[PDB]
């Protein structure tokens, strides 16, 4: 129950639902996809294997050099995470691929000439997902947010109110593809069913029908029914179709030989259908009234006379059919239809088409597709058919076809991949029966029409496009070479792949810049759902319908969690218990309740099946056995919470967590505070600030350890063992054999994230939590990351907060903070920034990294050495010099009075100058790491050598340790043989340490040869092994880090929804203190509650103090020197107040040494884990507080430290939890008002962070044009903001002093002015 680390810190688990399914790895979805991606796969695991197979084989024609595929071998991590993050190089691994090339002979029955299979082709270096779990490429950790777009199928969205403009509004239908073309289908009450492509116009549905060679006769014979009408004994009989009389009005007496069943007057509803079905009305006497509107499906003329009457598909009028009742006809086959329910819609659409033939109908399509040259047939055929019928590029898998058939009401959930003519007809009929009023409309909100994508899915398709750019670059070589000319590593490319791999893991609109500064910050900015994705929901298309919430999201998607800012509304997070299906779906864990007994068997349902079965919420009271104690419960039938019997319920939600995400589950008592505050809260999560000493949150959910321990932020262990060689760089573990694989002896290597860089200038911080000398377990930690203590997520920090208005210092968001924090570094964040200097090569000659620094002051010298670099560990602030950069002056700059010197005297004694690089305004830290590289082939100055020595020893210092351990082993072997053949304890203890005979003899020697050849190799690599790009040859990489503490204006908040900014620095004890002794540090005002429903301020605070009270008694039960038994029963009450709800007890080992220490670590309160949507309540909280004697009412009376008086009505004071964001103003507070402008014109040079400035636009121009102040208006658009000469000519006088200005001549006018002069216009200024 308790492990090696639980010996020190335990979180009070408190679940209301006795669980059967326990929490899994928090970042499942992400990390295991990485495992599937970069690994040996013998079949086709979604990742590098799926992509390559969906594109392979690469088949060409005439010659056949069909390139086939087998497998691929990868590379393991070469260096440690430490220096990879410090040097600033992509933490990747070489990708070697096994490509097979079978060259066939030109036109011979598969006569293979060569089946040459070559491996390890260099297809780049794929960026590795660290042990932490990020894509470290350009120094900044970047991770891809899993996405979601429209699932393949067909939707029917309403979207009312947007485009009615009269009252005759309609809806829209969009058939969604997977990898192909989207399809538009729209039927309107305007009596016109249209259809078009994304880049099309308004064309009838009959333009595809007639184009598929389906003539008028071929069309209306499929869409409409064949009814056998007959004329017997010279009188019209009719095979009345009741199913085709739905909604029809009874105008004529509907009879059956004398018995009028349906009366003339009241109509047909859905009862008289049965009253006509029961008597089988299929051959009755009827007038010709009812038929005088049907078009014929054949041809009929006078056979007794010899006269032609009509063609095909035409209504038969009063006299025509009468003639067809006297000449010689006994059969009549018209298309049975009416005018209310079933309508002759397409009969009214063929007329819309100007043509009637396939030929010209495609010419109409040619007018749409390509307007230009006079038409023929070539163009048509090609485009159109190869779009929907060619299967090579048009596909739909088994997900698209399912929603097809199921929504089209079929049974087979599989089919083809293309879209056929019979489907064009049938899916059209779908829209047709939805226009009749015999069918209904669906909704996009249904996750069946919502494809939830994994990073791997997105991967295959983006890279699929890359493979086509290169496939049609290889097929040329393949078509030409008959013999064995084309050889491996001469066809496949690398750049189109390089600008693709880097492009997806860090440049596509799926991947985002992960802001690293907290474990959860990483997590929620990593795994979520992003509609921003490629081909997903964009903000210029998705409206209000797309953003609506529906109970069909209960169990997988979180409409709750969606960050504030650029990407808002289009997120709707993925769940922790969520598992992306093999293709595109997502399965939700529900317990099977069989008519009474709730079975612990968990199932996986889809969005169709969820909305198809009766499922119970997480709010379903079970008791004693786990079965419903009640006989009724709220259940979703299709996504509607209604009432159901116990003998009908089929499901119930497993646990109170099998419904939400990382950012949703993380917040305690979500049911009580508003979820929109969780939306805003969603944003704030991925921005938690790195504190130095993270004290633990007094309250949680049980996913706190799920973050801290399982986020990669800590050096975990896959094979537990006795910690051995633990350092601040790498941790070495001696593995125990009960958990050891006999391979490679037993030395597990681990790398630490001990203070390195991060995207937002951050500095990831690792805090060692385990002391040396103790075995670990599979899943045990060594050193937890930022804002974590011994394994608990403490994003911000928990401390004393009181609620009392001071009129001025705390208006809602305004936070009243006390000196304490910033003064003690109990909340300090660290920040490392990075800079670098581009290299040499000039039209004149090489360049030097200064190697000095000419004509400067004393300061600029005491810091730059003979390498041109600043002493690491010096004082680099403001704008001190960092890297000395030399630049070849040039022909263009030379001077008359200086020449001849550099023409006689020497060579480089003058031509070179100094154009170094300095510290960007806004940085005050210390230069730390410096990595430099020199001129490949033709070595640089002394620096080349300074680099070699440096690196040689950096590597030696490590490779020596691990051998000294093993050599200690061989030491033992010799001391074991020596004694038996002559005891020499004292003798070997007096002789130097260098004083199975054949065994040792051989192995020792092999080792020595390696030593030699390896040192040679390293030196070799830095002399001429500098494989770099031409140009980047003398480059520099320098990092500068600054200790940053919170200053007035920083954004602190909470995990709930209330924000805030630190205000005026306040003294220490001028804040009201209490019975404990600690003066309150934070002061806010719940004035926002009576206004917005963020009840956390009343509540979260109350309960916060509760949990700390229990800690105050732990404090008591230890400070009094109490035996382990006293507090043991205290722990029993802690896990057994008086219920059956889980907390999971122990009762197995020594309750002495391993319970007493737990008090020594929980004397700071006892963190409680609460259930998300059915959590702890009032009566429970109070039960705990009466155990000894605690402040059940966390609303204690405060003594004002200003003097010593008591305030009226004791207030809600105690411990709550704050959440500071990454919004440290030192990233945006780079003061700039006057500096340098543009050269060519009045162009503004500045971005968002550094070199900032207020954007004065034309609308702000109107503000100035809106106030009575016309003088500042004058200035603002003349001298203050227009004339480049105006300000210069005036600044050089204001520095001298003169209170008044003069306009001059605006150069802008000088443009317009002369321009019109070319035309013939005159400017005139007289008198």
């Amino acid at each position: 129950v308790y492990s090696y680390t639980e010996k020190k810190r335990i979180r009070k688990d408190f679940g209301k639902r006795p669980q059967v399914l326990d929490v899994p790895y928090l970042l499942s979805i992400q990390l295991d996809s990485f495992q599937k991606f970069i690994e040996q796969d013998p079949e086709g695991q979604y990742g590098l294997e799926a992509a390559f197979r969906s594109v392979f084989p690469i088949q060409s024609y005439s010659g056949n050099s069909e390139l086939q595929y087998v497998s691929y071998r990868l590379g393991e991590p070469v260096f440690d995470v430490q220096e990879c993050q410090i040097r600033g190089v992509t933490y990747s691994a070489p990708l070697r691929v096994k490509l097979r090339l079978v060259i066939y002979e030109r036109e011979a029955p598969e006569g293979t000439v060569k089946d040459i299979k070559e491996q390890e082709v260099y297809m780049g270096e794929i960026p590795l997902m660290t042990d932490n779990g990020t894509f470290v490429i350009n120094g900044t950790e970047r991770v891809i947010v899993s996405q979601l777009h429209r699932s393949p199928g067909v939707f029917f969205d309403s979207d009312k109110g947007k485009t009615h403009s009269s009252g005759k509004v309609l809806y829209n239908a969009r058939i969604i593809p997977y990898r192909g073309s989207w399809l538009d289908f729209e039927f309107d009450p305007k009596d016109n069913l249209f259809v078009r492509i994304d880049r099309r116009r308004k064309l009838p549905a009959t333009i595809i029908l007639r184009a598929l060679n389906y003539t008028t006769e071929q069309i209306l014979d499929l869409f409409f029914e064949k009814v056998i009408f007959e004329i017997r004994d010279n009188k019209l009989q009719m095979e009345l179709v009741p199913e085709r009389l739905r909604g029809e009005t009874a105008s004529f007496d509907i009879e059956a030989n004398g018995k009028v069943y349906v009366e003339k007057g009241r109509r047909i509803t859905a009862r008289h259908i049965r009253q006509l079905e029961k008597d089988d009305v299929k051959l009755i006497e009827v007038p010709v009234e009812y038929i005088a509107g049907k078009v014929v499906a054949k041809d009929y003329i006078d056979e007794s006379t010899g006269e032609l009457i009509c063609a095909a598909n035409m209504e038969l009028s009063l006299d025509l059919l009468a003639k067809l009742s006297q000449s010689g006809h006994k059969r009549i086959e018209t298309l049975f239809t009416n005018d209310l329910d079933h309508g002759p819609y397409i009969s009214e659409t063929l007329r819309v088409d100007p043509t009637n033939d396939r030929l010209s109908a495609l010419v109409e399509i040619y007018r749409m597709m390509r307007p230009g040259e006079p038409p023929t047939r070539e163009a048509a055929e090609s485009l159109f058919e190869n779009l929907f019928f060619s299967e090579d590029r048009y596909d739909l898998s088994a997900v698209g076809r399912m929603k097809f058939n199921r929504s089209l009401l079929r049974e087979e959930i599989e089919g083809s991949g293309i879209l056929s003519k019979d489907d064009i007809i049938d899916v059209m009929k779908k829209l047709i029966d939805i226009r009749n009023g015999k069918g209904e409309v669906d909704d996009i909100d249904h996750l069946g029409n919502r494809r939830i994508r994994s990073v791997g899915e997105m991967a295959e398709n983006q890279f699929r496009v890359g493979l086509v750019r290169v496939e049609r670059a290889v097929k040329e070589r393949l078509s030409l070479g008959d013999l064995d000319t084309l050889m491996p590593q001469d066809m496949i490319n690398a750049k189109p792949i390089s600008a693709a791999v880097k492009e997806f893991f860090g440049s596509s609109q799926l991947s985002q810049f992960m802001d690293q500064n907290n474990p959860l910050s990483e997590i929620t900015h990593k795994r979520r759902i992003s509609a921003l994705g490629p081909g997903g929901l964009t903000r210029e298309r998705a409206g209000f319908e797309v953003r609506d919430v529906h109970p069909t999201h209960y169990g997988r998607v979180c409409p709750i969690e969606t960050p504030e800012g650029p990407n808002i509304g289009l997120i709707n997070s993925l769940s922790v218990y969520a598992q992306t299906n093999e293709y595109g779906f997502l399965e939700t864990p529900y317990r099977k309740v069989t008519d009474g007994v709730v079975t612990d068997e968990i199932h996986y349902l889809s969005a169709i099946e969820e909305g198809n079965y009766v499922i119970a919420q997480a709010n379903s009271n079970l008791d004693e056995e786990g079965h419903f104690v009640e006989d009724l419960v709220t259940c979703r039938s299709k996504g509607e919470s209604s009432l159901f019997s116990r003998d009908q319920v089929d499901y119930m939600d497993v646990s109170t967590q099998q419904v939400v995400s990382v950012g949703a589950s993380l917040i305690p008592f979500l049911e009580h505070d508003d979820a929109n505050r969780a939306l805003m809260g969603a944003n704030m999560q991925r921005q938690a600030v790195p504190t130095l000493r993270a004290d633990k949150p007094l309250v949680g959910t049980g996913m706190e350890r799920a973050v801290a321990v399982d986020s990669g932020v800590t050096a975990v262990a896959k094979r537990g063992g006795v910690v051995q060689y633990v350092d601040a760089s790498r941790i070495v573990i001696k593995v125990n054999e009960d958990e050891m694989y006999p391979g490679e002896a037993g030395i597990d290597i681990y790398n630490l994230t001990k203070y390195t860089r991060s995207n937002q200038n951050t500095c990831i911080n690792q805090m060692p939590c385990v002391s040396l000398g103790e075995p670990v377990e599979r899943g045990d930690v060594l050193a937890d990351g930022p804002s974590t203590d011994l394994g608990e997520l403490a994003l911000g920090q928990n401390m004393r907060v009181a609620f009392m208005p001071w009129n001025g210092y705390n208006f809602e968001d305004s936070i009243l903070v006390s000196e304490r924090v910033v003064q003690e570094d109990r909340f300090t964040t660290i920040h490392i920034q990075e800079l670098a200097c581009v290299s040499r090569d000039t039209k004149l000659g090489p360049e030097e990294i200064t190697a000095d620094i000419p004509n400067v002051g004393e300061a600029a010298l005491s810091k730059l050495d003979e390498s041109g670099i600043v002493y690491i560990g010096a004082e680099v602030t403001g704008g001190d010099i960092l890297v000395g950069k030399v630049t070849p002056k040039g022909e263009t700059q030379l001077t008359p009075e200086e020449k001849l010197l550099r023409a006689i005297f020497g060579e480089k004694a003058s031509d070179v100058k100094d154009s170094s690089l300095r510290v960007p305004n806004g940085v005050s830290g210390t230069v730390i790491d410096v990595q430099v590289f020199t001129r490949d082939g033709v070595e640089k100055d002394k620096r080349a050598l300074e680099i070699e020595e440096m690196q040689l020893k950096q590597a030696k210092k490590d490779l020596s340790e691990e051998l000294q351990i093993l050599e200690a082993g061989l030491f033992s072997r010799i001391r074991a043989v020596l004694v038996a053949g002559g005891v020499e304890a004292e003798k070997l203890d007096k002789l130097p340490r260098d004083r199975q005979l054949e065994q040792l003899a051989e192995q020792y020697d092999e080792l020595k040869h390696e030593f030699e050849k390896k040192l040679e190799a390293k030196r070799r690599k830095i002399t001429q092994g500098d494989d770099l790009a031409p140009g980047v040859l003398k480059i520099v990489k320098v990092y500068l880090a600054v200790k940053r503490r919170i200053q007035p204006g920083d954004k602190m908040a909470g995990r709930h929804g209330n924000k805030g900014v630190i205000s005026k620095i306040n003294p220490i004890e001028d804040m009201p203190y209490d019975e404990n002794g600690t003066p309150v540090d934070i002061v806010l005002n719940p004035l926002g509650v009576p206004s917005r429903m963020n009840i956390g301020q009343i509540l979260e605070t109350h309960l916060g103090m509760a949990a700390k009270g229990i800690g105050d008694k732990i404090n008591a039960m230890l400070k009094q020197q109490q035996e382990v038994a006293k507090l043991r029963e205290f722990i029993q009450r802690a896990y057994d107040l008086g219920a059956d709800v889980r907390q999971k007890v122990d009762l197995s080992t020594f309750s002495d040494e391993e319970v007493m220490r737990l008090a020594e670590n929980l004397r700071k309160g006892m963190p409680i884990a609460t259930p998300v949507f059915d959590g702890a309540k009032e009566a429970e909280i109070k039960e705990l507080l009466k155990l000894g004697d605690l402040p059940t009412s966390g609303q204690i009376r405060l003594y004002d430290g200003r003097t010593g008086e008591q305030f009226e009505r004791p207030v809600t004071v105690g411990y709550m939890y704050m959440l500071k964001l990454n919004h440290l103003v030192d990233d945006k507070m780079h003061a700039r008002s006057t500096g340098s402008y543009s050269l060519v014109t009045q162009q503004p040079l500045g971005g968002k962070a550094q070199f900032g400035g207020q954007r004065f636009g034309e609308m702000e121009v109107w503000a100035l044009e809106a106030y009575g102040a016309a003088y500042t208006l004058q200035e603002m658009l003349t001298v203050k903001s227009d004339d480049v000469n105006g300000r210069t000519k005036m600044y050089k006088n204001i520095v001298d002093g003169n209170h008044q200005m003069e306009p001059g001549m605006p150069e802008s006018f000088n443009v317009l002015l002369k321009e019109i002069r070319s035309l013939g216009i005159n400017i005139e200024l007289e008198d």
Partner: protein, 48 residues
Amino acid sequence: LHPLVCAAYNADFDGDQMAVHVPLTLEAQLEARALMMSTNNILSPANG
């Protein structure tokens, strides 16, 4: 800032971003304290 002016600005004390423009000439300066000063225009162009 003086609290009794925030009503006009419809703001409080918790994050209102404002820019400070420097009058380079007496022109701006004179309008500043004459027709722009808080204490010199306690009326609104909508009524009293």
